Write a protein that binds this DNA or RNA. Structure first.
Ligand SMILES: [Mg+2]
Length: 758
RNA sequence: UUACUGCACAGGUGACGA
DNA sequence: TCGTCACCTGTGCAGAATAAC
């Protein structure tokens, strides 16, 4: 019935007396906050400076003496609450402001976990994992039209390596190549320094340096990355350190699992409620009841969308609630019409892996048999094909080759394809040592580039994957198979939809930011994905091939007007039919581009039809989480009383935060991985205020459905494919643009229907 | 680069205003 | 060209046999 938040009501005064000055130049703000510090809280907003006296005593300030009512303009006290919260907890130092973020004072989980696993070492004490809390004052709407201010509590972990580098070398750890950051960060300065090349002195030489190429061991520390944690801890504890890691894992679950997260939030609120918070020398705020999402009173703030249906035919008849159960039963959605029932697949691999590749190939095509029910039938039978012909392309290359692997792959491919006929896809096997080389010598991107130029999509695979034990291999081959079929132009499945309106187009934009290393400046690229309403089905449209970030707003416009025009011809809209267009991205569009897009789409479809348009952003990293106390979770393992997903809301729960925003739960207990998996964070779905379509509950459920549309895997994706696919297109095309002999000519010819980006 | 999930660190960035 | 609110993207590691069943 009810969903509990991680936030607390804040009781504020109805009203606060203020002094206002017009200050059209906001540069002035800096100095004025200083001149009046301590006596005045100061705030700029729409051309005016607002002054809230906090302590008696000059300096005095001029301006109009206006009252500000909290119900009408809650931004004022919300901002003041950022500062007030810090001052209410003066024993807890801010490591970050707005939101106020601070460290637990006693608990330190590496010590705790070493003790708990029975481990010790003289440098452990310099490895620290400390709980970090943030208190975020946010405006929300308990019912439509009335605003309130809540305080939302979030929990993470500071990882830090405070050990001096002299010790870590002397203890047996190769520092070479690790990233190094400033111990003491310079006022609004960069922290990262570079990577350690060597040490011959108290100063260390750097490569991939951000500043000067030298700094003192006492100005520098390792960054608190996991990489540096495991590299350092394996080379001081191993191979026993895995016992530490899971011990550490056990400790953090003590702050992040549902019940334990709910408890820490409760205790934070009890602490914050003990006194009143001092907004000013005689005005008080009071932290109150835990905020809830419910349908009690006049509130209609929680709902549960129905389960998504994976659908495998166009009459609606062949549906399932899980993609893979649906695929095995029915075979793929487009099986009746699928054109090429005998595909020829190039398989490019190091000659010395031959036997391993043949067994992976045999399992993929013909299956693993009934002892491995995850992948019994194999690709040909799973997808309803006649057969699959493999064209073997061994490459005489060794994992130690670091400079010429790519040219050897590309020469082998070229010489093999010149005799042979047409191949319809390829499989490229990569050595793990080659997978992450720089792109100028990386065989993943060069073989991808060569084969895409020729109109051949590829499914690549790293040797550690080819060698997976059978219990995992079966799942690997489910995803491998779904993406290969899609790259052969197949459609594995759709998700259900009942059209209220005569046509619905969703288009999404994604971003990728590319650089050779953490020093070089990242270059932005974009991708565009389209999805169409069908008869009971969401259908994946075509996909961008141009990827430059400069001008992306015009590219959104062209793809929409072009698709609308084509949809009108196909479907032959009647006078009075309603067309709906939805846009998806991880960031909001500018108002001016919304206006430009509405205008062009409105003109394109013309006056015979009604057009509805909605502009949506999907956020993952916000201060909101949802707790379902009625949820006991699931049994994790055999002989395991321990549970997973305890308090996790169900997949499809949609909570109202305000008029334009919903919280969307995607990871149910069924999908949560492990007993120690944190309480999941829901997606935040936000509607652009200039949208002409306003039903964000519907848009929240549409985004949910689009997570189930991913053909990269049998399991749902963490964001709708409108965005996800586009990010994958953007990164690929971005990388390919710099590869010699890359050409996009075939992306709209041979690859027009290929899901080559999966 | 089979993926899902999680976390960490780093870089910063976006939208709205005058 | 600043204030203010907000959180995005890249990378690397690991999974109480990781894989909705
Ligand atoms: Mg892929």
């Amino acid at each position: 019935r009810q969903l509990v938040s991680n936030g607390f009501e804040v009781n504020l005064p109805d009203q606060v007396e203020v002094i206002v000055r017009d200050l059209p130049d906001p540069s002035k703000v800096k100095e004025e906050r200083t001149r009046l510090m301590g006596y005045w809280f100061v705030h700029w907003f729409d051309g005016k400076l607002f002054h809230l006296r906090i302590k008696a005593g000059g300096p005095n300030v001029d301006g109009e003496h206006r009252a500000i009512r909290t119900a009408e303009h809650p931004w004022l006290l919300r901002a003041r609450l950022d500062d007030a919260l810090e001052e209410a907890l003066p024993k807890y130092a801010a490591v970050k402001k707005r939101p106020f973020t601070f460290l637990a004072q006693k608990d330190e989980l590496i010590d705790a976990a070493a003790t708990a696993a029975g481990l010790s070492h003289r440098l452990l004490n310099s490895f620290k994992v400390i709980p970090r809390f943030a208190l975020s004052p946010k405006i929300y709407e308990p019912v439509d039209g009335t605003t309130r201010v809540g305080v939302f509590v979030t929990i993470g972990m500071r990882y830090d390596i405070e050990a001096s580098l002299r010790d870590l070398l002397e203890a047996g750890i190769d520092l070479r190549g690790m990233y190094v950051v400033r111990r003491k960060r310079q006022p609004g300065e960069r922290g990262l320094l570079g990577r350690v090349r060597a040490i011959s002195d108290d100063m260390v030489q750097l490569f991939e340096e951000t500043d000067l190429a030298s700094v003192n061991v006492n100005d520098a520390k390792l960054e608190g990355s996991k990489e540096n944690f495991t590299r350092c801890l394996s080379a001081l504890l191993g191979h026993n350190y895995k016992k530490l890691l899971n011990a550490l894992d056990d400790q953090e679950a003590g702050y992040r699992t549902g019940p334990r997260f709910d408890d820490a939030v409760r205790r934070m609120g009890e602490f914050l409620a003990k006194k009143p918070i001092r907004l000013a020398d005689n005005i008080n705020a009071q932290v109150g009841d835990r905020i809830v999402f419910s349908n009690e009173g006049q509130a209609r703030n929680v709902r549960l969308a129905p389960k998504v249906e994976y659908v495998f035919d166009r009459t609606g008849a062949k549906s399932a609630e899980y993609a893979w159960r649906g695929l095995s039963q029915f075979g793929p959605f487009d099986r009746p019409s699928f054109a090429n029932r005998s595909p020829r697949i190039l398989v490019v691999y190091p000659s010395s892996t031959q036997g391993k590749v043949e067994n992976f190939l045999s399992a993929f095509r013909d299956g693993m048999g009934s002892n491995y029910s995850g992948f019994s039938k194999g690709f040909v039978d799973l997808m309803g094909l006649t057969k699959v012909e493999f064209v073997m392309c061994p490459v005489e290359v060794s994992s130690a080759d670091r400079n010429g692997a790519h040219t050897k792959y590309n020469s082998a491919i070229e010489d093999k394809l010149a005799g042979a006929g047409e191949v319809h896809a390829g499989i490229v096997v990569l050595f793990e040592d080659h997978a992450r080389l720089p792109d100028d010598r990386n065989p993943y991107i060069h073989t991808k580039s060569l084969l895409l130029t020729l109109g051949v999509p590829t499914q690549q695979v790293r040797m550690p994957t080819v060698l997976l034990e059978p219990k995992s291999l079966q799942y690997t081959l489910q995803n491998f198979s779904i993406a290969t079929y899609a790259k052969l132009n197949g459609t594995p499945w759709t998700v259900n939809h009942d059209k209220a309106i005569n046509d619905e187009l969703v288009v999404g934009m994604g971003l990728a930011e590319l650089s050779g290393s953490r020093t070089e400046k990242r270059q932005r690229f974009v991708g565009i994905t389209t999805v169409f309403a069908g008869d009971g089905s969401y259908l994946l449209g075509n996909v961008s091939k141009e990827c430059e970030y400069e001008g992306y707003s015009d590219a959104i416009r062209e793809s929409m007007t072009g698709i609308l025009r084509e949809l009108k011809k196909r479907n032959n809209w009647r006078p009075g039919d309603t067309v709906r267009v939805v846009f998806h991205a991880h960031r909001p569009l500018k108002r001016v581009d919304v206006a430009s897009i509405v205008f062009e789409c409105t003109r394109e479809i013309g006056s015979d039809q009604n057009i509805q348009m909605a502009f949506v952003t999907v956020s993952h990293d916000h201060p909101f989480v949802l707790i379902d106390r009625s949820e006991r979770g699931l049994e994790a393992y055999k002989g395991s009383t321990a549970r997973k997903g305890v308090f996790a809301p169900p997949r499809g729960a949609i909570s109202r935060v305000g008029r334009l925003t919903r919280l969307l739960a995607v990871n149910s207990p069924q999908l949560i991985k492990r007993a120690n998996t944190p309480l999941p964070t829901p997606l935040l779905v936000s509607l652009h205020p200039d949208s002409t379509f306003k039903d964000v509950d519907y848009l929240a459920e549409q985004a949910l459905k689009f997570t189930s549309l991913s053909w990269r895997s049998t399991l749902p994706a963490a964001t709708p494919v409108t965005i996800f696919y586009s990010e994958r297109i953007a990164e690929l095309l971005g990388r390919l643009k710099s590869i010699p002999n890359w050409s996009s000519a075939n992306l709209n010819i041979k690859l027009k229907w290929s899901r080559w980006f999966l």
